[PDB]
Structures are given as C-alpha cells and as structure tokens.
Design an enzyme around this catalytic site. Structure first.
Site, PDB file in Angstrom:
ATOM      1  N   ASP A   1       4.419 111.746 -56.628  1.00 54.12           N
ATOM      2  CA  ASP A   1       3.610 110.575 -56.179  1.00 54.12           C
ATOM      3  C   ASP A   1       3.514 109.547 -57.312  1.00 54.12           C
ATOM      4  O   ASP A   1       4.240 109.712 -58.307  1.00 54.12           O
ATOM      5  CB  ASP A   1       2.238 110.993 -55.637  1.00 54.12           C
ATOM      6  CG  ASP A   1       1.418 111.866 -56.572  1.00 54.12           C
ATOM      7  OD1 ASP A   1       1.855 112.079 -57.719  1.00 54.12           O
ATOM      8  OD2 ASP A   1       0.344 112.327 -56.141  1.00 54.12           O
TER       9      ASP A   1
HETATM   10  C1  LIG Z   1      -7.543 111.830 -75.169  1.00 51.20           C
HETATM   11  C2  LIG Z   1      -8.504 111.641 -74.022  1.00 51.20           C
HETATM   12  C3  LIG Z   1      -9.187 110.300 -74.029  1.00 51.20           C
HETATM   13  C4  LIG Z   1      -9.325 109.671 -72.670  1.00 51.20           C
HETATM   14  C5  LIG Z   1     -10.240 110.422 -71.744  1.00 51.20           C
HETATM   15  C6  LIG Z   1      -9.774 110.471 -70.313  1.00 51.20           C
HETATM   16  C7  LIG Z   1     -10.849 110.139 -69.314  1.00 51.20           C
HETATM   17  C8  LIG Z   1     -10.378 110.096 -67.885  1.00 51.20           C
HETATM   18  C9  LIG Z   1     -11.492 109.992 -66.878  1.00 51.20           C
HETATM   19  C10 LIG Z   1     -11.588 108.640 -66.199  1.00 51.20           C
HETATM   20  C11 LIG Z   1     -10.367 108.296 -65.412  1.00 51.20           C
HETATM   21  C12 LIG Z   1     -10.511 108.524 -63.938  1.00 51.20           C
HETATM   22  O1  LIG Z   1     -10.771 109.597 -63.452  1.00 51.20           O
HETATM   23  S1  LIG Z   1     -10.257 107.063 -62.991  1.00 51.20           S
HETATM   24  C13 LIG Z   1     -10.307 107.707 -61.301  1.00 51.20           C
HETATM   25  C14 LIG Z   1      -8.923 107.888 -60.734  1.00 51.20           C
HETATM   26  N1  LIG Z   1      -8.944 108.077 -59.292  1.00 51.20           N
HETATM   27  C15 LIG Z   1      -8.612 107.123 -58.416  1.00 51.20           C
HETATM   28  O2  LIG Z   1      -7.895 106.172 -58.721  1.00 51.20           O
HETATM   29  C16 LIG Z   1      -9.158 107.266 -57.013  1.00 51.20           C
HETATM   30  C17 LIG Z   1      -8.167 106.833 -55.964  1.00 51.20           C
HETATM   31  N2  LIG Z   1      -7.043 107.753 -55.866  1.00 51.20           N
HETATM   32  C18 LIG Z   1      -5.786 107.391 -56.086  1.00 51.20           C
HETATM   33  O3  LIG Z   1      -5.464 106.231 -56.330  1.00 51.20           O
HETATM   34  C19 LIG Z   1      -4.708 108.468 -55.976  1.00 51.20           C
HETATM   35  O4  LIG Z   1      -5.215 109.592 -55.257  1.00 51.20           O
HETATM   36  C20 LIG Z   1      -4.058 108.897 -57.311  1.00 51.20           C
HETATM   37  C21 LIG Z   1      -3.628 110.367 -57.243  1.00 51.20           C
HETATM   38  C22 LIG Z   1      -5.054 108.758 -58.466  1.00 51.20           C
HETATM   39  C23 LIG Z   1      -2.823 108.051 -57.619  1.00 51.20           C
HETATM   40  O5  LIG Z   1      -2.327 107.446 -56.390  1.00 51.20           O
HETATM   41  P1  LIG Z   1      -1.029 108.075 -55.663  1.00 51.20           P
HETATM   42  O6  LIG Z   1      -1.545 109.093 -54.667  1.00 51.20           O
HETATM   43  O7  LIG Z   1      -0.344 106.901 -54.997  1.00 51.20           O
HETATM   44  O8  LIG Z   1      -0.201 108.704 -56.769  1.00 51.20           O
END
Ligand SMILES: CCCCCCCCCCCC(=O)SCCNC(=O)CCNC(=O)[C@H](O)C(C)(C)COP(=O)(O)O
Ligand SMILES: C/C=C/C(=O)SCCNC(=O)CCNC(=O)[C@H](O)C(C)(C)COP(=O)(O)OP(=O)(O)OC[C@H]1O[C@@H](n2cnc3c(N)ncnc32)[C@H](O)[C@@H]1OP(=O)(O)O
Ligand SMILES: [Fe+3]
Ligand SMILES: [Zn+2]
Lengths: 29, 210, 87, 123, 233, 249, 265
Positions: free
Chosen positions: C43
């Site tokens: 994906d």
């Molecule tokens: C070294 C460490 C330092 C950094 C720390 C890391 C912290 C991370 C925590 C914050 C980040 C998040 O969770 S940000 C939240 C991320 N989730 C979303 O975006 C919700 C919507 N979902 C989607 O877009 C898809 O299911 C997806 C599979 C994501 C892709 O799309 P595809 O399905 O088309 O591949």
C-alpha cells in the site's frame, strides 16, 4: 555671462600655463 | 470615459530618441555599424560590426534579446521583436547571425536565422521558427511558429513551402550580397559627423523666446 | 580507472534483494518489471518505505517527485543506475 | 509546415551537482554542450566554441554505460583533455566531453550527469 | 565626380574641426546642451550629389524619408512614414500621385542580381498603404492596392489594378484594364468603368486632402509645447 | 609559465619585460665586471641550450595564448644568454640589442592580448576569423608573430642572426644545429596563429571589442618599429656598443 | 566666477565664433550639397479639419507615432513606434487596454464603393500586431490581429476571434467568434482553444505593463536623461571584491530597476 566652476577655471588656467610655458621653453632653448 | 491630460506633449522638439534604454538594458551599437537616424532601438539590442539597420526599422528588445550579427543587414521598415518564451521550448531570443540579408518590410519575432541566409522582402518569421544556414526565403513568405527552413533550399509562399534545392554557386552568392549591402551602408555612414548641429537651432529657438 | 556510476546489472541485483527482503514481498513476484502497488501487494505507506529503503542501501536521498515515479522495479533501477550520487 | 523545429528536438535529462534532475531540450545535429547551455546548466561564457582546441573540459559530463554504447568512442584527444583536467589526473570511464557529443534521434531519453564547474576565467 | 567627392570629404574635415571647436567653446562656458540626443532625421537627405528634387506643390510628410535622386511632380503627395530610396538608381514620381502612409518605394541596393532597375511612377497614380515597390514601373492612372509587393522589372500598364496584398513576381507585366491579385499575382477579373472613375476621383481627392495636411503641418511650431518640454520636472 | 598564466594580464605584461632588464644589468655587472673560469660561461651556455629546446617544444604543445607567450619568452632568454656565454664585447652588445627588441615585441604582443581580453580571449582558436572581423588588427598581430619567428626584414631577425654568428665564430656547431631546429619549430608554432586568424573558417566566431586609444597608439608605434627598425638601426647599435664598453672602461 | 570666469567666458565666445566660421567654410567647400539637419517638425498629436485627437491620461503614445484628426483612445491603451492613426476623413475609435504595435497603419474611408461607409472601430483589450493595416473595419473586444495582417473596409472581427499573421482579409468579411482565419485571401483555419483565449487576454495585459516602462522612458527630460546615462555607466560593471575590502555594498539605484511585471520571471 560668467563661468562659475572654479575648479574648471583653475584647470583651464593650468592648461594655458602649460601651453605657454612649453612655447617659451622651446623659444629660449 | 476618455479623460485627457493637459500636459501631454503634442510636439516634441527633440523628435523620437533613437536609443531607448529600459532600466539597465542599453542598446549596443558597434562603432562601425550604420543605423539610420529614424530607427528605434529599445532594450536588449546588440548591433554588431559591419551591420546596418535602415530607415523606419524598429528593434524592440523589451521581452528578450535581439542581436544583429556581423555584416548582417535589417532593411527598411522591418520590425524585429521577441517574446519571453517559444512554443518549441528553446530560448526565445531573436538571433540574426552573420552575413544575413533581411529584406525590407520583414517582420521577425523570436526567430533564429543561421549565418549566410537571405530573407525576401515582406516576409514574416514567427515565434520559435528557425532558418538554417545557406537558405533563401522568397519575398512575401510566411513562416508559422516553430516551423523550419532546411539548409541549402529555396522556400516561399504563405505559408512557406519547399520550392527547390539551391545550387552551390547560389549559396556562394549570399555572403557577397551581405558584403555589397554593407558597402552601400558605408556611403550613408560617411554622411554623418559624430555630432549634429541641431543644438544650435535649439539654442536660437530658446533665445528668441527669452 | 575511476567510475561515476553503479553497474546496471549490479543495481538490478541490489534493488531486487532490497524489494524481496522487505516483508510482505514473496521472492516469487519480484521481476525487474514488477510494480509495487499493482503486482506486489504494497500500500502507500509500504510503497514509500521501499523507496527510502533504496535510499539507505545506495546512500543518497531521492528527490520526492522522483520517489513517486518509482512505482516499479524498472523505474527504480532506471533511476539509481543513472544517478551519480548512488554508491 | 512539413519541416518543423520539433523534428530536430531531442528530449534529454540532466542531473545537476546537487542531484536534482532536469528535463532539457536540444537540437539533433548540435552538441550536448549547446543543449546544456540553453538553460544555463553549463555557463555559455565558459565554453564559447564547440572545438576540441578550445576545451579545458568545461563541457565535461558523466554518462551511464547504457548511453555510452550509443555514442562514438572517445578519441585520443578527448581522453588526453579529460585526464589532464581531472584534479587527481585520473581518467573517468563514464566521462565525456560535451562539446564532442553530437545529439541524434537515437539519444532520446538519455540521462546526463553535470559535474561541479571547474574554474575557467584565467586572469 | 572624383573631384567633387574629394572636396566633399575635405569639407567634412574642416566642418568636424569647426564643430569640435564650438564644443570646446561651450565646455569653457559650462554648457552641455550639445550632448542632447536630438533626432538627426532629414525629410530630404542627399547622398553626396544625389539629392531629392520635390515640386513646391507636392506635400511631403515630415516623418517621410526621401533619400537620393527622387523626383516628385506637382500635386503629388508623400504621406506619413513613407520611405523612398534612390541611391543605386533614380526614383521618379509623376504629377498628381499619392504615396499612402508607410509605403516603401525603393531600388535594388546592389547589382549582384543584375543591373539595378529604377522605379517609375506615372501621373495620377494611387499607391495604397504599406505597399512595397522595388524597381518596377507604374504607368499613368493605375491602382496599387494596400500591402501589395511589386518586384523588379514589373510593368503595370495604364488603367491596370494590383489588388491588395498581391505579390507581383519579377518581370510580371500587368495588362491594361486587368485586376491581378494573390500570391503570386494572377489575373482575377477585368476592370469596370466605374472602377476607373473611382480611381481618378480618388487621386483628385487625395491631392485635395494632401493640400489640407500640408497646410496644418506648416503651422508655426507651438512655443507652449516647447516650454512645457523644457520645464518638465 | 604557471605564474604568467595565473596572474592578471597587466601583471604578466609587466613581469615579461621590466625584471629581465634589471637582472641582466645585475648579471653583467656581477660576473663580466668580475673574474672566474669559463665555468660560469659553461653554466649559461648549457642553460641557453636547454632553454631553447624546452621553450620550443613546450610552446609547440600550447593551446592557450598566454602560456605560448611564456614559453616563447623562455626560448628567447636562451637565445639572449648565448650572447653572455661567448664573453666578447659583441656578445654583450648583441645581448643588449636582443633584450631591447624582445621588450618592444613583447609590449606589442601584450597590447594585442590586453585589447582582446575585453572579450576574454583564452585560446588560440578564439582568434578564428579575426582577419575578417578586424583586418588591420590581424595584420598587426601577424607582423608581431613573424617578428617573433625571426623572419627578415623584421626586427626579430637580429637575435637569430647573432645566435648563428656567435656560434660559427666561437666555433660551436651543435649550437648551430640546435638553433636551426628550434628556429624552425618556433616558426611553425608562430605561423599557426597566422593560420588561425587567416585560413580557418570556424562555425562560430568571436567578435572582439575595439581597443582603447592608448593601446592603439602604442601598437601603431611598435608595429612601425618592428617593420622598419632595420632600415635605420644605427642609434640602437651605437648606444648598445657604448654601454658594453662602459662596463669595462 | 569673478574676473577669471568672465575672461574664460569671453574666450569661449571667441572660440565658438571661430568654430562656427570654420564649419561654414567647410560647408562651402562641400559645395552646399549636404542638406542640413533641422529641428524636428514631427507632430505626435495633430489636428486636421478642426478635429482634435482625444487621448486619455495614461495612454502611451510613442513620440514617433502620428495620431491625426478625430481619433479617440481609451484608458490603458498604447500606440507604439511608427504607428499612424490618420482619422482625417472619418472617425477612429480605440478602446481601453488595446495595443497597436509598431509600424501599424490605421486609416478610414470617407465613402466606400458600395454599402454604408463606417469608421474604424477597435474595442477593448485588443491586440494589433506589428505592421498591420486596419482600414475602415471593426474589431470587437478581446480580438487578435496578427502581425502583418491587412483588414479592408467592412471587415468585422468578432469577440474572441483571431486573424492570423500575414492574412489579407477581403472587404466585408466577417470573422466569427472563437475562430482563426488566415491566408491570402483569408479563410477559416480552425477553432480557437481556451488556452488561446487566455493567450489573447495575457497579451493585452502584458502590453499594458510594457507601455508603462516605455512611456516612462520616452518622457524623460534632458537633465534626467543625462543623470541616468551617468548612473548606467557607473553601475555597468562591478568589483564586489574591493567593495568587501572597503566594507561597503553598492546598490543599484531605483531609476535603473524595472518593475517586476515586465521581467521574464
Ligand atoms: C525516532 C522516532 C521519532 C518520531 C516518533 C514517531 C511518532 C509517530 C506517531 C505520530 C504519527 C501518526 O500516527 S500520524 C497518523 C497516521 N494515520 C493516518 O494517516 C490515518 C489515516 N489512514 C491512512 O491514511 C492509511 O490507513 C495509511 C495506512 C496510514 C496510509 O494510507 P494507505 O492505506 O493508502 O497506505
Ligand atoms: C506578449 C505579446 C503578445 C502579442 O501581442 S503577439 C505579437 C505578434 N505576433 C503574432 O502576431 C503571431 C500570430 N500567430 C499566427 O499568425 C499563427 O500562424 C497562428 C497562431 C494563427 C497559427 O499558428 P499554428 O502553429 O498553431 O498553426 P496550425 O497549428 O493551425 O497549422 C495549421 C496549418 O496552417 C498553415 N499555417 C499555419 N499558420 C498560418 C498562416 N498564418 N498562414 C498561413 N498559413 C499557416 C500550416 O500549413 C499549418 O500546417 P502545418 O505546418 O503542417 O502545421
Ligand atoms: Fe569541450
Ligand atoms: Zn486609407
């Protein structure tokens, strides 16, 4: 009626003195 | 509403200035080039050695560079202009190379003319068009944008069409024509001293007016 | 003599191994022309991961607009085999 | 009008020293150097003639092997210039003199790497 | 001849010396007005002995360019922006002929392509706007359309009409009473008597309009505009 | 060669003339006025031969104008030092004459180079079609190049003449052979510049800005001297003979 | 100033007298053949038959242009170098934001051969290319006339219509909207795309910007012309290295900087 640039007037006099002095230098050498 | 201004000049005693700078864009004329008195050069215009620009011609380099190469001539009432960009994507400067004869009443805009070519009188060369070396365009020819004149050929018409292939003697004739036109322009160049005497007329016209 | 590019076959190989080792990629559908989304079951989040896994292996950063025209193994190998910054 | 400038247009891509890829445009029958100078990728002032006798490898480019097959092999003068103009005096096997490469329709889509410019303006 | 050209050249040496002397005299008095870029355009310009001879009744627009041996007859008119060059051969314009705005009447610059043909314009001839006449002959009472091009050796017979935008190729003889048009110009139709009446009436009208324009240009130069340009800030 | 090329062109012009006069004066007053075996004369003899050979070959290899002028100057100092080696009054006279003529010719060449540097002349190939774009300038540079090659009746022929005269007098024949070969090589790489300005028909030309009044006046005077010195050369001959004797008596 | 200034002034007067006498003697030796240059008698704006051109405040009229008679030009329009707008026997109307490019002729007719003779009407935001000929016709708003085109009497160019460069449009021809015509005689070529309508509009808008810089330059007085000549000379080259040694930064004066709306970027 009058030329007002005093530096230019001095330079004109200097050029005149150069020319006249060259003439006199030739005539008396 | 058409609202006029009282202070707009109806008669300018100086006439039209020949060299029109545009910011830092100053037309550049070679010391041994002939430019007719009523020609207008504006902006990024470079007129090289042995070249001539004749009466009524307008060279406006405000959107791109305009160059008249060595021993090239732009004749009477030609308009040479340029655009920001070409439909072909290539740089849109107007380049007149060496030994090029641009016939009178020709209109050029963002075209490239390779060395040793002849452009017939009343021809039109449009944006991005290219005339390759050792080619001749007939009088009245129209070259659409981006079109090309292959080297060693004679073309003409509206739009320009292939007529025939040039003999080698014909191609040898072209720089000779450029040289002859430069020789003629020398006779005009010798008619002008480095300064005019108009400033004296301006002086007396002022003096009569107090 | 000094070279300024990685050999194409050597790249094809390095890219083939990177894509296969990435989990969810069975070493059966990984052909030099295989596409990430349509033919590999990866994906968008898995697809961006592969591209930066190509950045780690070859030690250079791919401009994003290129990271997007890398949807398959040809497009990635076409890019790395012609990029001088690849090592 | 039968003959068009687009007939001679050869698509190209160039990778700059900072690594970003650019799609550039040149006429077949002209040199790669001229195509590179159209957009200023190589300074036109640094290489004004397409002659091997007016070259200090200011026009040097790096080309991957899949496109080197499609070009004529380097002559002795080209390799002499490239080797002497190297900082380490080592010939680069992917290096070409851009002023000696003539664009053809067979070079459509070729990728070229533009190295960092050498000093050229002798005081 | 050679003696006249030598005298003309030596005169330029004396003149250039005198003008430089005048500039020196102004520089001593702190005047720099000699540096003003003023137009060197001349309505009537000579190439050594070859000078234009213009009838006292013929109107010439101040912006027109008449160069070399150019004869203009009585009642004729040269309109705004017109260029007439008579250096390598002569240009003659008959009585009652109008050369409309931005027209170019010129001869070949060089003899490379053969002997340089002169340009002959007959009487009561209409030359339309921005027409190009190059080393051709135009007989009395003919009509040249606006934007037409007549190359060298072209003969336009009396009461003959060249349509607008027509490119008449070299050595193309237009017979009397015929309308020729297109690129290249070919026979199109025969001329009608009403067209001949309109031709004559048009040339008579242009002679009267030229008289009007020659009067308003003769008006003394406005000192108010001079003072406005001088006092700009 | 490296310093001449890398310095700004006026610096190169100044270094190619002024310091030679000052140090040759020093050399003549420290050794000729002094006393030791022919050892020092052998030193300058061998250095002259090496300088002619290396200068000729390296100048033949050059594609850039400044480097060519540098190697040409090295070859000519070899020609000049031949006059010091022979240890006669005529040797010192011919050394002074050679220094004078080389200085004037070098000033001519560097006036041309400085005039062309407004358009950034860098390669010999940049002079293509100069006979068309500035005919008088191409002739002036050719007169200088033929003077450099030593072709008579130009002023540069004096150095060649004395080189061969001293050799067939001091009894040297290897020196005569080296002079012949180096003169021919020099003629080749000098007339290459004339061939570039007159014979070649390049696809792309370079149009050069005209020079200022200073360089044109200096060029006109040096060109007249080069073409016409041998018609009336007596003052230089007499003044150099005068100087040669002032060293001893 | 003072006695020395007056003395030098008198000497300069003598020098100018001698210079003019020498100039006259040289002219006599030339054989009185050379025609003398005179003060310019060209009138940019001229009346005729008691009709005065009506030009809006912010209209660029090149000094070399000839605007004659009953001619009306609207706001933002531009009349370029060598243009002749002779409205003597009839009316010439030019709308707002319309460019009439270099060496164009615009004329009218008192009476045409047949039909109703009409004036020359040019609408708003209209581009007329270089060296065009517009004679007794009508160009509606947002239309395009290519360079070197010739429109005869009775021609009507409709809104968003294009006449190609070099076209000879015959009398009473109508160019319909969204169409491009061309040739000699002109005839239908194809339809105009939306990108081409955008091109036409952007052309008129670009020319309003170009008119401003040209109008600014052409209206400068002698003193300002000389000041800017000196400035242009002073800032033509640079030695930023010696400036950095001196600890100064040389800035281009505003009179030498063009507005951003005319630059290629
Ligand atoms: C070294 C460490 C330092 C950094 C720390 C890391 C912290 C991370 C925590 C914050 C980040 C998040 O969770 S940000 C939240 C991320 N989730 C979303 O975006 C919700 C919507 N979902 C989607 O877009 C898809 O299911 C997806 C599979 C994501 C892709 O799309 P595809 O399905 O088309 O591949
Ligand atoms: C920022 C400032 C903007 C300005 O103010 S513009 C300044 C002045 N510039 C201009 O006026 C440019 C005007 N552009 C045009 O006129 C141009 O042609 C035009 C815009 C109609 C047409 O240009 P095109 O390149 O788009 O021509 P076509 O694609 O329609 O080609 C059709 C056909 O017509 C023929 N050809 C096309 N054009 C013309 C003509 N006119 N005549 C005759 N024959 C033609 C030709 O055979 C063509 O076939 P091909 O050559 O095989 O492609
Ligand atoms: Fe090169
Ligand atoms: Zn009319």
């Amino acid at each position: 009626k009058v030329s007002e640039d005093k530096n230019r007037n001095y330079a004109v006099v200097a050029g005149v003195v150069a020319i006249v002095g060259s003439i006199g230098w030739y005539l008396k050498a | 509403q058409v609202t006029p201004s009282p202070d707009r000049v109806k008669w300018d005693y100086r006439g039209q200035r020949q060299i029109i700078p545009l910011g830092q864009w100053l037309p550049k004329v070679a010391v041994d080039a002939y430019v007719a008195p009523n020609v207008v050069l504006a902006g990024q215009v470079t007129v090289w050695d042995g070249s001539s620009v004749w009466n009524g011609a307008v060279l406006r380099g405000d959107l791109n560079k305009i160059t008249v190469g060595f021993c090239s001539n732009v004749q009477e009432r030609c308009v040479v202009h340029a655009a920001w960009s070409s439909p072909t994507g290539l740089p849109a400067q107007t380049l007149i190379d060496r030994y090029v004869t641009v016939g009178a009443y020709s209109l050029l805009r963002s075209c490239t003319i390779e060395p040793e070519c002849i452009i017939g009188q009343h021809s039109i060369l449009m944006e991005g068009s290219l005339v390759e070396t050792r080619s001749i365009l007939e009088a009245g020819s129209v070259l659409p944008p981006g079109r090309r004149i292959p080297s060693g050929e004679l073309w003409g018409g509206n739009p320009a069409r292939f007529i025939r292939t040039l003999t080698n003697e014909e191609t040898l004739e072209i720089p000779k024509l450029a040289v002859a036109i430069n020789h003629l322009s020398g006779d005009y160049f010798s008619e002008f001293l480095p300064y005019s005497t108009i400033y004296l007329e301006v002086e007396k016209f002022k003096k009569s007016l107090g | 003599v000094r070279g300024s590019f990685l050999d194409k076959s050597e790249v094809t190989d390095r890219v083939l191994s990177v894509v296969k080792n990435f989990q969810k990629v069975d070493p059966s559908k990984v052909t030099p022309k295989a596409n990430f989304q349509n033919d590999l079951g990866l994906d968008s989040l898995d697809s961006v991961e592969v591209v930066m896994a190509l950045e780690e292996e070859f030690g250079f950063e791919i401009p994003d607009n290129e990271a997007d025209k890398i949807q398959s193994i040809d497009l990635a190998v076409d890019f790395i085999a012609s990029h001088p910054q690849a090592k | 009008g039968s003959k068009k400038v687009s007939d001679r247009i050869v698509k190209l891509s160039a990778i700059d020293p900072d690594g970003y890829k650019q799609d550039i445009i040149g006429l077949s029958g002209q040199t790669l150097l001229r195509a590179l100078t159209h957009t200023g990728l190589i300074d036109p002032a640094s290489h004004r003639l397409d002659d091997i006798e007016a070259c200090s490898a200011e026009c040097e480019v790096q080309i991957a092997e899949e496109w080197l097959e499609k070009l004529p092999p380097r002559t002795y003068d080209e390799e002499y210039v490239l080797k002497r103009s190297s900082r380490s005096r080592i010939l680069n096997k992917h290096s070409r003199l851009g002023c000696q490469v003539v664009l053809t329709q067979e070079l459509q889509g070729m990728v070229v790497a533009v190295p960092e410019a050498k000093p050229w303006d002798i005081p | 001849g050679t003696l006249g050209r030598a005298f003309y050249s030596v005169g330029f040496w004396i003149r250039e010396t005198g003008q430089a002397l005048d500039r020196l005299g102004c520089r001593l008095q702190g005047k720099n007005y000699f540096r003003e870029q003023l137009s060197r355009h001349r309505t009537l310009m000579n190439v050594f002995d070859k000078a234009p001879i213009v009838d006292k009744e013929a109107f010439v627009a101040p912006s027109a360019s008449v160069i070399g041996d150019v004869h203009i007859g009585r009642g004729s008119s040269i309109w705004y922006g017109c260029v007439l060059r008579g250096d390598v051969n002569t240009v003659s314009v008959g009585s009652g002929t109008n050369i409309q705005d931005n027209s170019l009447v010129h001869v070949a610059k060089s003899n490379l392509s053969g002997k340089v043909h002169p340009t002959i314009i007959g009487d009561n001839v209409t030359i339309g706007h921005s027409a190009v006449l190059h080393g051709c002959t135009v007989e009395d009472e003919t009509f040249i359309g606006m934007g037409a091009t007549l190359l060298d050796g072209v003969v336009v017979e009396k009461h003959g009409m060249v349509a607008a935008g027509a490119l008449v190729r070299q050595n193309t003889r237009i017979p009397s009473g015929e309308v020729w048009g297109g690129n290249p110009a070919r026979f199109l139709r025969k001329l009608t008597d009403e067209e001949i009446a309109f031709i004559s009436q048009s040339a008579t009208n242009y002679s009267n309009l030229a008289q009007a324009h020659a009067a308003e240009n003769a008006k003394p130069l406005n000192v108010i505009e001079f003072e406005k340009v001088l006092r700009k800030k | 060669p490296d310093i001449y090329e890398g310095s700004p062109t006026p610096v190169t012009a100044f270094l190619s003339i002024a310091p030679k006069i000052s140090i040759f004066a020093n050399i003549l007053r420290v050794f000729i006025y002094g006393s030791y075996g022919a050892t020092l004369q052998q030193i300058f003899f061998f250095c002259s031969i090496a300088s002619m050979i290396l200068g000729a070959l390296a100048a033949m290899a050059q594609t850039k104008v400044k480097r060519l002028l540098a190697y040409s100057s090295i070859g000519h100092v070899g020609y000049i030092c031949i006059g010091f080696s022979c240890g006669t009054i005529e040797g010192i006279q011919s050394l002074l004459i050679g220094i004078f003529i080389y200085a004037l010719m070098t000033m001519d060449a560097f006036a041309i180079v400085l005039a062309l540097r407004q358009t950034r002349v860098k390669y010999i190939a940049d002079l293509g079609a100069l006979a068309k774009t500035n005919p008088i300038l191409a002739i002036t540079f050719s007169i200088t190049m033929f003077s450099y090659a030593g072709i008579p009746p130009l002023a540069g022929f004096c150095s060649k003449f004395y080189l061969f005269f001293a050799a067939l007098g001091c009894g040297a024949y290897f020196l005569a052979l080296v002079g012949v070969v180096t003169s021919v090589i020099g003629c080749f790489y000098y007339i290459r510049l004339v061939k570039r300005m007159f014979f070649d028909t390049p696809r792309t030309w370079i149009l050069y800005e005209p020079m200022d009044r200073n360089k044109s006046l200096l060029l006109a005077m040096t060109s007249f001297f080069i073409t016409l010195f041998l018609l009336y050369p007596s003052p230089l001959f007499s003044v150099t003979h005068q100087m040669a004797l002032s060293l001893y008596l | 100033m003072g006695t020395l200034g007056r003395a030098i002034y008198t000497v300069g007067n003598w020098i100018r007298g001698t210079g003019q006498a020498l100039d006259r003697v040289g002219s006599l030796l030339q054989g009185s053949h050379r025609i003398e240059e005179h003060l310019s008698r060209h009138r940019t704006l001229m009346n005729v038959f008691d009709k005065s051109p009506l030009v809006d405040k912010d209209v660029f009229v090149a000094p070399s242009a000839s605007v004659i008679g009953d001619v009306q030009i609207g706001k933002g329009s531009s009349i370029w170098y060598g243009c002749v707008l002779r409205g003597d026997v009839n009316n010439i109307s030019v709308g707002s934001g319309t460019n009439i490019q270099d060496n164009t002729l615009v004329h009218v007719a008192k009476t045409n051969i047949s039909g109703k003779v009409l004036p020359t009407l040019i609408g708003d935001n209209v581009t007329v290319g270089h060296s065009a000929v517009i004679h007794g016709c009508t160009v509606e708003d947002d239309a395009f006339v290519g360079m070197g085109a010739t429109l005869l009497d009775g021609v009507v160019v409709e809104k968003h219509a294009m006449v190609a460069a070099g076209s000879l449009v015959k009398q009473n021809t109508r160019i319909p909207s969204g169409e491009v015509w061309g040739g000699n005689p002109a005839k239908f070529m194809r339809k105009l795309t939306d990108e081409e309508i955008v091109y036409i509009s952007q052309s008129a808008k670009n020319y309003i910007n170009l008119a401003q810089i040209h109008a600014s330059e052409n209206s400068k007085s002698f003193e300002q012309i000389e000041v800017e000549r000196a400035l242009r000379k002073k800032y033509a080259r640079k030695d930023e290295d010696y400036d950095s040694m001196l600890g100064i930064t040389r800035e281009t004066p505003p009179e030498l900087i063009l507005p951003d709306n005319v630059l290629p970027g």
